[PDB]
Design a protein around this ligand. Structure first.
Ligand SMILES: [Mg+2]
Ligand SMILES: [Mg+2]
Ligand SMILES: [Mg+2]
Ligand SMILES: [Mg+2]
Ligand SMILES: [Mg+2]
Ligand SMILES: [Mg+2]
Ligand SMILES: [Mg+2]
Ligand SMILES: [Mg+2]
Ligand SMILES: [Mg+2]
Ligand SMILES: [Mg+2]
Ligand SMILES: [Mg+2]
Ligand SMILES: [Mg+2]
Lengths: 122, 158, 85, 135
RNA sequence: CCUCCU
RNA sequence: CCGAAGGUGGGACAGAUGAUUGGGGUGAAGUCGUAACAAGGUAGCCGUAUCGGAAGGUGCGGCUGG
RNA sequence: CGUAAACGAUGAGUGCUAAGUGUUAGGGGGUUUCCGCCCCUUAGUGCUGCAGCUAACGCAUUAAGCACUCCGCCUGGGGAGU
RNA sequence: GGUACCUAACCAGAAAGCCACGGCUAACUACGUGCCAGCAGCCGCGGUAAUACGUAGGUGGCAAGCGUUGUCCGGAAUUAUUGGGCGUAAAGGGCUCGCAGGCGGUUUCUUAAGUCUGAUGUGAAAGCCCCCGGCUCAACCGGGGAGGGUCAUUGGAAACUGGG
RNA sequence: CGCAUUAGCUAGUUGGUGAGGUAACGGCUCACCAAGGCGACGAUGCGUAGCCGACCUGAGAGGGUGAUCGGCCACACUGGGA
């Protein structure tokens, strides 16, 4: 359940789109990523598997991406739980961390406000 | 542009022939504006002028610019070339160029005045520090990122 | 009465054979100091069950008391869960 | 190593060894035990005075003492200084420096614990050879 | 087959 | 009654020391050969066995880092 | 008995990331009566070669690439696998 | 203890030092030795022209001392959680089967141990430190804070990890 | 805190019931019952050590120290008892 490597690998070879097995949180990550401007639309099909639809992330609609050099790292099975106070910022801004909360995500202000740091990405 | 040149090192190198050892000098020279531009330099295993000539080409070929938010770089970056590994980390005002030897030369002639820099492997490792300064230009200041993303500058930072 | 409560614990009953007595095992996940992984810790305890009601599997609550033996320090306040076989 | 591996078996530091082990052992007459005490010098009695050839690429007659310390450990130690400071079987104080040439000689005899000379009329830092400054 | 030491 | 010290006993453990003995390290210019590095003059090396002043040799199987 | 240069000197599992060409055992589908040719495809086994990686040599969908899980192992040379 | 401090002469008189100067790290020449005598933190100097040895004359730091030896941390991303590796540099177990352990597809519901979060109590004094004041500034003393907890107790949140 | 080149340890030991003792709870002591308790999350053994405020160092993580000064503990020629 690592979309990040799927993205990195396709992003490296400047692929137009990629089909990632869908899960609720992998759906909710792709939309966080889409907040910038990736994904145009997907095709929900008759469900046989729970993810056959995939995420269909299409960050390279044109020849070259305006949003290129996508990079992620902080995804270990050893759980890394952030304090609302001590949520990090990727590159001191210019990068986001998908901090899984009971009710919120994203910036440093969206930590002391929202609360549960939980997961931490880059 | 108005370049200043700095001599990093001059090592006597040698080829062996039937006669014996035949010596040349390989000079390594950093060159830069002191205002965002800086060049690698090689020295063609002969002299310093040969080094300067190649340096002044590499300033405009390689490091097209060194991004500079104030008197420091935009973000923290790890420059790696071979076993070169430089940490280049943005500092506060009045910090100084805290860096070691060859790294200092680059950052001084780049015009960076406030930076923290640790070397994690050492041997005229200017190529590694060059790759980081380019890696800043991947996400310079914030104008590109915002434009690349599809956002404003204050939207991106806060 | 406005009494400050003693430290209360809850866990599975690992021992019972000892009559008027049990061993309650408060399993928990302490973080390792350096490496930060949640390691499966387990503290055994010694509580008192006068009736001899508890058995293997019971996720009982226990509260601190006067020292009821050399090792015993708690009472069976209530059998919350009642596992069988 | 995996995190699980690092938990199961931690990291292990390198054991750094002292360059002067003989000055680290005290002694007790009563218990007849060495004690762990960080000494800067040790008194001893010279059991043998002589000369020894250095290793390559050097040649010399390097004057030394086999010395028996207060802690009961027998060391070899270099008699430093130009001119005959070699001395004979007698009490002496010792120091912690190796003679790179002489293999086994991990200690110097301190010049000034008794009758010494060393290099007389030293240029500067005139305190290394027991050179009493004349007036 | 061997080719003293620095 | 309990009971310190003491006595007796057979074990356990640790250090020191011991005729002699074993390899090890080190040491400007000792003796013997020349095993390895080139196809190193019988390609070398690995495991094992056996033999031989000594490097080593030979068998069997393996490897190419021939 | 329990060791080998027991070697790919490369732990196992999983996913992802250009191509080209042999070959082993299958499968499906072309017009065709088959044979045969052609296309596709699974699992092996080779060679060449992108990106990426590498101190370099080289590796490259049979990764030494990009990731995650778990195990084994390393920490200057000798002394000593004593 | 007729001791600190003041006045007032004799008067700047009484109050300069040690170490270092190949390179690291800003800092050289005569002579005497002749692989000797000696030097050496490391690299290394000396076999009859020694900028690193014996002597003789000559210079940057910190300031009655500074040299030498000993111990600890740093430099050492050199035991690497932060932050390293294992084709050939040291390093893949000869290969399986597997107990424990570690780790585990997707949805939904519920739970709330973990996770997060609010509030309350303590974590002396000194020391170091945030504002820092006072004592002429100091080589020093006071107050109000802060840190200090894998810490209680209690009320939430419930995405994620765990349980049904 | 170190050592698995220390893997089994324990027999008032583990719990009960009763009696006694104690300022006081209690195998704390004893009687009589059972058969427990501890341990790979390292018991047991061996080695080392007063612990803490702090101190030194370091970007920090960490590492080392615990003289002087403050707090808790322990001891008072060696050992036992009131
Ligand atoms: Mg030969
Ligand atoms: Mg041969
Ligand atoms: Mg034979
Ligand atoms: Mg083997
Ligand atoms: Mg084989
Ligand atoms: Mg092997
Ligand atoms: Mg298996
Ligand atoms: Mg370190
Ligand atoms: Mg090798
Ligand atoms: Mg190897
Ligand atoms: Mg293998
Ligand atoms: Mg003690």
């Amino acid at each position: 359940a690592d979309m990040l490597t799927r993205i990195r690998n396709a992003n490296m070879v400047r692929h137009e789109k990629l089909e990632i097995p869908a899960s609720k949180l992998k759906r909710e990550i792709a939309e966080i990523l889409k907040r910038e401007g990736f994904i145009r639309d997907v095709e929900f099909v008759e469900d046989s598997k729970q993810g056959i639809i995939r995420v269909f992330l299409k960050y390279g609609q044109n020849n070259e991406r305006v949003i290129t050099g996508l990079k992620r790292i902080s995804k270990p099975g050893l759980r890394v739980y952030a304090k609302s106070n001590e949520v990090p910022r990727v590159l001191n801004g210019l990068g986001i961390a998908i901090i899984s909360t009971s009710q919120g995500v994203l910036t440093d202000k969206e930590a002391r406000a929202k609360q549960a740091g939980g997961e931490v990405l880059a | 542009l108005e370049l200043e040149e700095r001599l990093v090192t001059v090592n006597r190198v040698a080829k062996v022939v039937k006669g014996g050892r035949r010596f040349r000098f390989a000079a390594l020279v950093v060159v830069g504006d002191k205002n965002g531009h800086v060049g690698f330099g090689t020295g063609k295993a002969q002299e310093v002028p040969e080094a300067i000539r190649k340096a002044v080409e590499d300033a405009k070929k390689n490091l097209i610019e060194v991004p500079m938010v104030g008197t420091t770089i935009p973000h923290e970056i790890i420059g790696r070339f071979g076993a070169g590994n430089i940490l280049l980390k943005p500092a506060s005002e009045g910090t100084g160029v805290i860096a070691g030897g060859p790294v200092r030369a680059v950052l001084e002639l780049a015009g960076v005045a406030d930076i923290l820099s640790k070397s994690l492997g050492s041997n005229t490792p200017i190529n590694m520090i060059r790759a980081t300064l380019q890696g800043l230009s991947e996400l310079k200041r914030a104008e590109d990122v915002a434009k690349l993303r599809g956002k404003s500058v204050e939207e991106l930072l806060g | 009465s406005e009494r400050n409560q003693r430290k209360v614990y809850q866990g599975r009953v690992v021992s019972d054979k000892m009559d008027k007595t049990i061993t309650v095992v408060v399993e928990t996940y302490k973080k390792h100091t350096l490496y930060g992984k949640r390691v499966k810790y387990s503290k055994k305890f010694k509580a008192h069950d006068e009736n001899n009601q508890a058995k293997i599997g019971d996720i009982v609550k226990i509260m601190e008391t006067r020292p009821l033996s050399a090792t015993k320090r708690f009472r069976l306040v209530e059998v919350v869960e009642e596992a069988v076989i | 190593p995996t995190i699980n591996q690092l938990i199961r078996k931690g990291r292990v530091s390198k054991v750094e060894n002292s360059k002067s082990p003989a000055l680290n052992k005290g002694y007790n007459s009563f218990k007849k035990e060495h004690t762990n005490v960080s000494s800067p010098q040790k008194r001893g009695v010279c059991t043998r005075v002589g000369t020894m050839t250095p290793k390559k690429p050097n040649s010399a007659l390097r004057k030394y003492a086999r010395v028996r310390l207060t802690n009961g450990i027998e060391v070899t130690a270099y008699i430093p200084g130009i001119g005959h400071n070699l001395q004979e079987h007698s009490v002496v104080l010792i120091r912690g420096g190796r003679v790179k040439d002489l293999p086994g000689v991990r200690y110097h005899i301190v010049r000034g614990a008794l009758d010494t000379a060393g290099v007389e009329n030293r240029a500067q830092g005139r305190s290394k050879y027991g050179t009493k400054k004349p007036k």
